[PDB]
């Protein structure tokens, strides 16, 4: 799994984008907390639990609140460019 930022294109399906995000207040980061088996994110093979979402369709989400990121993803349309960077060490702060 590359640690460099990676460009991923997901096409929304009946189950949505096929992943969940976790975040907090601005600056805590936005991370993929779950990927649905057989959903669009899984079929791409490119996203991982523990990825930080750096941007969505050119919207910088590095310092976004959970709410800001959730609305960005909801309004990103039916094709979504995600810039992701694998950061399981930071993600784990959010996982019980």
- Total residues found in the chain within this entry: 96
Would you say 19 and 47 are in contact if contact means Cβ atoms under 8 Å apart?
A: yes
Cα gap 11→23, rounded to integer Å: 23
The reported resolution of this PDB entry, expressed in Å, is 1.5
Residues contacting residue 57 through CB under 8 Å, at least 6 positions apart: 72, 76, 77, 80, 81
Segment (H or E) for 6:
strand 6-11
Segment (H or E) for 90:
helix 88-91
In 3D, which of 68, 59, 60 has the Cα closest to residue 23? 68
């Amino acid at each position: 799994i590359p640690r460099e930022p990676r460009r991923i294109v997901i096409h929304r399906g009946s189950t949505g984008l096929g992943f969940n995000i976790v975040g907090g207040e601005p600056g805590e980061g936005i991370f993929i907390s779950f990927i649905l088996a057989g959903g669009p994110a899984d079929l791409s093979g490119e996203l991982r639990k523990g990825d930080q979402i750096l941007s969505v369709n050119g919207v910088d989400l590095r310092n976004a609140s959970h709410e800001q990121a959730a609305i960005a993803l909801k309004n990103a349309g039916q094709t979504v460019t995600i810039i992701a960077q694998y950061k399981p060490e930071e993600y784990s702060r959010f996982e019980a």
